[PDB]
Design an enzyme around this catalytic site. Structure first.
Site: not given
Ligand code: 9RB
Ligand code: K
Ligand code: ZN
Ligand code: 9RB
Ligand code: 9RB
Ligand code: 9RB
Ligand code: K
Ligand code: K
Ligand code: K
Ligand code: K
Ligand code: K
Ligand code: K
Ligand code: K
Ligand code: ZN
Ligand code: ZN
Ligand code: ZN
Lengths: 370, 370, 370, 370
Positions: D144, D181, D183, D269
């Site tokens: 990311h 992954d 995402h 994931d």
């Molecule tokens: C934005 C945001 N805003 N809020 C309020 C919330 C609760 C937010 N989540 N953030 C996230 C939630 C999950 C991931 C997973 C990443 C992964 O598995 N990478 O491959 C990354 C960021």
């Molecule tokens: K991916």
């Molecule tokens: Zn992921």
């Protein structure tokens, strides 16, 4: 009259103690993060859940905590400290309350108010005669917080806020705070140092926490001289030492002083299994301490006694220490301590010469309690 | 020669201590389940992870554990006990090893073998001169397990399996086991009770665990009479007591006995923050204990010293106690104890009269070590 | 009339789910022990604590659970099953209820009775008109347990015990159980298979659990033929699919049947963040499902609706899904879902052709509900 | 040649993910603190411990992580981003990296360097021919993090640092990053957007995270146009969809591009039990994906393939998904997936029309990979 108040608020269990052990986790120091900080709220939550699951809750009158107002807090603390706690709680995350250890989340002030407010509410309802006595199972604890700071996991000095309320709002002339948390109640000592209208008594392990604090020579000042009583005890002290301290010093001090209300800073960190001190008190020891103190209240101040939770760090054993005190309030003795036999063979049940002498150091100070 | 062996096996961290605190969770007793049993493997895993993250691992020679064979176990234990452990481990889930407390999962025998086998492997490699010394960070612990049973979280008596190997396989005439876990090494005492070829020494808190065990009068029997030495110390004993015990009893005993190998049952449950005892040893105390013992080995048995992990229940502080011992083996002193100043003010650093007298009780027994 | 019942019992949070993930920990399979089993009671306890901390508890009427009697259990289950649960609970450390997965501690039957009894007690008070509706936040769950067994973490079928009570004790002719836990309510289906007096509806992810169960062709037998309705939905189904299922099948089925009481098996394992299913329902989805069902009850059975907790395995998100349902009962909408924006962009809000077709398979079955 | 590298560093397990679930704990929002954040390092640590306990470690060549230098990081990221990470890590208690979610402790930059450095060190040793392939089990993850920021738990883009190193230091003309992954690898996409010398492929759940990112129309720009390939798949996609995507798009794309090294962003994931996505891949699915990709590397770039850990949030199941990939590298298939039968009946093993069509949208883009 018999009606026993009990204060638990859900948020007492939601205090964020972070990801460190004691201080914060620290990579350069190689202090690895851990799920449960020593002071994690689960220990006191397990006490509450045992109060319920044991059926003691059926014999208690549940009392809602009411948030301590600014005015309530200002009877114990400085405007600067209150303002600083608002500030750190108002910060987008939260922050360090001052001492590099005692931390508060965004909105964590809400829990600090409900903790001091739980003590106040129960004090009010006992003092009025609505209740005969009670137990405020609050969190965060209070007794380390002096007039102008947070300290030792304590944001506000809950028992001193309650005493301040009994003094200023209820017009009591004389209040006693008996603190048997294993650590010195330095905050409470500080707050009432110059003040004879609140007798402050602390039984503790000598120099456990804070360092260089809780000596017998710390006796108050001015008109308050003689109205602070420290009972430092040696590491390894058990039920025999604690009961000798109760019989020789604590109960005579209370009888001499004639408080109109007794507030107990009720920690269980003197227990045989506590990580944060070296004492040997068992649930049966705490039971006998509670019985003695409640009976003293019955004799001298119409049974007006309010227990307020302080420390204790054994999630395994603290619930049974606590339950024993609750059982002495309710008079319903319906569950054994399942650790009793295991811990009873470890000792602490004989008054050692060193323990006796540490206690006898305080007896000549009793004559100065007018 | 300088090469320091280190044994860690992943499975040491996978020991299933269940969902109770000490005994199992128990609904009728209202003992609520908890995530971390007092003896949970995370405490020793955190020690291992600190060995790695501190960079001490770069100065160590990693040694693979090799599973203790039936023949290895039978030098310390009865065929009935071994058979019983196979039986309970073979059971579809697992079961109670006998004492209503020490439990083993299906296949948990695999970890018990690797734990005793880790001690054996390190003993072999030190005895041959491949290594000069080492630390076997094993789990489950050993010193409570007597000849015919599991006891006190111990399935097999790891240090006695290692001693049995040094005796029978390596042909050593004299081995010493020095146990400074805070609890009495009753298992080790039992195994070698009639046997002068393994000197068994236990420093411990008097009557902490087991109950009614570890008195100075427990001295062995027959040809072994005089070759078991118990040093019971009072609750509250700290660095000054422990070092006085080392200087007055332990080191003289070893010098008198002239073992060809020293095995240390290295527990850290005497630490200032341990829940399962009331002692006040700091990381610096353990450091000095280790330094003294390693130097003694250098003087009397060509440096042949093997540390084997026993108990210790502070996941917060045990890693730093352990690391201090590792640093004394490697001679690379690269990380401070971050609790040092916090704990140093609590005491334990003065030899109290009671502590001195408890130690002096054992000195006249030194003359019977031929 | 408006008075909303709420059942939580401390022991619901004390269910011992062990040290495994799903099945038990297993050394030979290298399934490492873990602190929190997927079904660990903390998930539901966090829902309870949010009901309190949100202030919803102030708008609820707390109802004590009363232990289900043998007679209560026998309206849903066989004497053999009850006897077997007594047996396994009576065993010194409990045991396997039959399926190699669903375990019960010593005394664990106490919690199973209080769980079924919580459903019964709330049903009684709603049916009688003391309460207008309620939520029984029980644990262990029920809907997998058929007439003659425990299954899928379920010891007794709580909603079927409650329905059996409404039938036999309260004399209701027609009761409906609507189960929106993401897994098929095979137990409930089994219990009332031959019985038209309890309409059983299950919305679920097709073949999620149990395997080979919950097909649209499973329709009851004999006089019960047509009075079991399965709505299997594809993985990835979200709010649009669930609401289409409510509007096209569930609500029409209830209107056709004219139950005198609606019981909802209220699981939140269809949530967007659940590990144990692949569905995309948000707190707002559950809110709309609850609103629709409560409004249906108001239209057809004088508002008599009882929600009984089933599954759900996100300790992070389940509390907000649950709170949304509680808010629809109380009408006090005082807290946002803090995940709303984060989850709303993931999708599930458009009715896909495959989702629509799965739902439409059930619509022709509506004509056989007389 | 056959020698398989493996990177684990103790500090990968010490990443402090805090006391929240996803965002921080938040009292005003009533987001209760929890011990294990969704991204807690235990999930990956359990994968490491399984690599060891399964005996796979005996078939691996352990490779020490070497900290990524500033120069290493600057091949992927801006000087401003690096400087900002130094700043936030230098701050007394660390801080917010920018996005209100991705946090770093004091000294947390040490772990971020070791994570990117682990990817680099393994890339070097595979590229050079010392190793034939490997797996870098790093943490924190990378995909990311775009050129100028931290995002989605990622401080630096580990695979892009490794690719940048292969390009600039090892002089490779063509590198491919295949990211499975669940995402979208928006960071990786951003970094190489204008660059045809790194082909960037991302298979992911459509719009899972980030929102409004990972559309098939995002194809690079300038000379890089056609050298970014997004394969967005619908929620509920399982082994059949993933393998169809591999066979129809991924493997043909790699064959067309002729990279000199393949780097896999290996998240798990997409597993059947992951809380943070809705996909249905099993350990056997990941096994087949890994087998295909390794065989492709053997065909086109002399077996030069480096796996680098990305996300995955099931501490229960991720270890088995990971182990399956390790087993395909070593060729030693010595442990079953103990969830295999339980998960195999849930579905995902048939290619649905919607899944097929989503994949087929990408096939015409293959012709623009020159
Ligand atoms: C934005 C945001 N805003 N809020 C309020 C919330 C609760 C937010 N989540 N953030 C996230 C939630 C999950 C991931 C997973 C990443 C992964 O598995 N990478 O491959 C990354 C960021
Ligand atoms: K991916
Ligand atoms: Zn992921
Ligand atoms: C100082 C200091 N410095 N450091 C680095 C650390 C880790 C320090 N410990 N602080 C403490 C530790 C324990 C308490 C217990 C209080 C209690 O039970 N009250 O009743 C209070 C403060
Ligand atoms: C007896 C008994 N009965 N019950 C009910 C309980 C809960 C009992 N405790 N057993 C114990 C408790 C602690 C140890 C520590 C051993 C160690 O550190 N070794 O070095 C051993 C046994
Ligand atoms: C069978 C079986 N065999 N094995 C080997 C395993 C790992 C099995 N899973 N059992 C399960 C797994 C999940 C549930 C969820 C129930 C729920 O949410 N109810 O609504 C029930 C049973
Ligand atoms: K005073
Ligand atoms: K005190
Ligand atoms: K002996
Ligand atoms: K000992
Ligand atoms: K039916
Ligand atoms: K269902
Ligand atoms: K590109
Ligand atoms: Zn304390
Ligand atoms: Zn011990
Ligand atoms: Zn379910």
């Amino acid at each position: 009259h018999h009606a026993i108040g009990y204060v638990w608020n859900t948020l007492y269990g939601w205090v964020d103690t972070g990801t460190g052990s004691l201080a914060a986790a620290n990579l350069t120091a190689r202090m690895q993060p851990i799920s449960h900080h020593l002071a994690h709220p689960d220990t006191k939550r397990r006490f509450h859940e045992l109060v319920c699951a044991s059926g003691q809750i059926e014999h208690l009158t549940p009392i809602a905590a009411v948030a301590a107002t600014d005015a309530d807090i200002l009877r114990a603390h400085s405007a600067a400290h209150l303002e600083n706690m608002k500030r750190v709680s108002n910060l987008p995350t939260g922050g360090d309350t001052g001492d590099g250890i005692t931390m508060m989340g965004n909105g964590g002030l809400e829990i600090a108010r409900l903790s001091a407010g739980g003590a106040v509410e129960l004090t009010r309802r006992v003092a009025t005669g609505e209740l005969s006595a009670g137990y405020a199972l609050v969190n965060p604890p209070g007794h380390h917080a002096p007039h102008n700071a947070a300290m030792g996991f304590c944001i506000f000095n809950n028992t001193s806020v309650a005493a301040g309320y009994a003094r200023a709002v209820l017009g009591m002339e004389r209040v006693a705070i008996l603190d048997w948390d294993v650590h010195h109640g330095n905050g409470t000592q500080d707050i009432w140092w110059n003040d004879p209208s609140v007798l402050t008594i602390s039984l503790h392990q000598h120099l456990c926490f804070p360092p260089d604090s809780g000596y017998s020579t710390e006796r108050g000042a001015g008109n308050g001289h003689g109205y602070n009583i420290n009972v430092p005890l040696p590491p390894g002290s058990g039920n025999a030492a604690y009961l000798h301290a109760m019989d020789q010093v604590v109960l005579p001090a209370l009888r001499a002083y004639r408080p109109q209300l007794i507030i107990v800073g009720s920690g269980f960190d003197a227990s045989m299994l506590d990580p944060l001190a070296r004492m040997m008190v068992t649930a049966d020891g705490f039971r006998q301490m509670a019985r003695r103190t409640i009976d003293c209240a019955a004799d001298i101040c119409d049974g007006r006694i309010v227990f307020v939770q302080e420390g204790g760090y054994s999630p395994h054993y603290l619930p049974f220490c606590g339950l024993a005190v609750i059982e002495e309030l309710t008079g319903v003795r319906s569950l054994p301590d399942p650790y009793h036999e295991f811990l009873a063979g470890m000792g602490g049940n004989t008054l050692l010469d060193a323990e006796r002498a540490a206690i006898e150091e305080i007896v000549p100070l009793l004559a100065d309690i007018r």
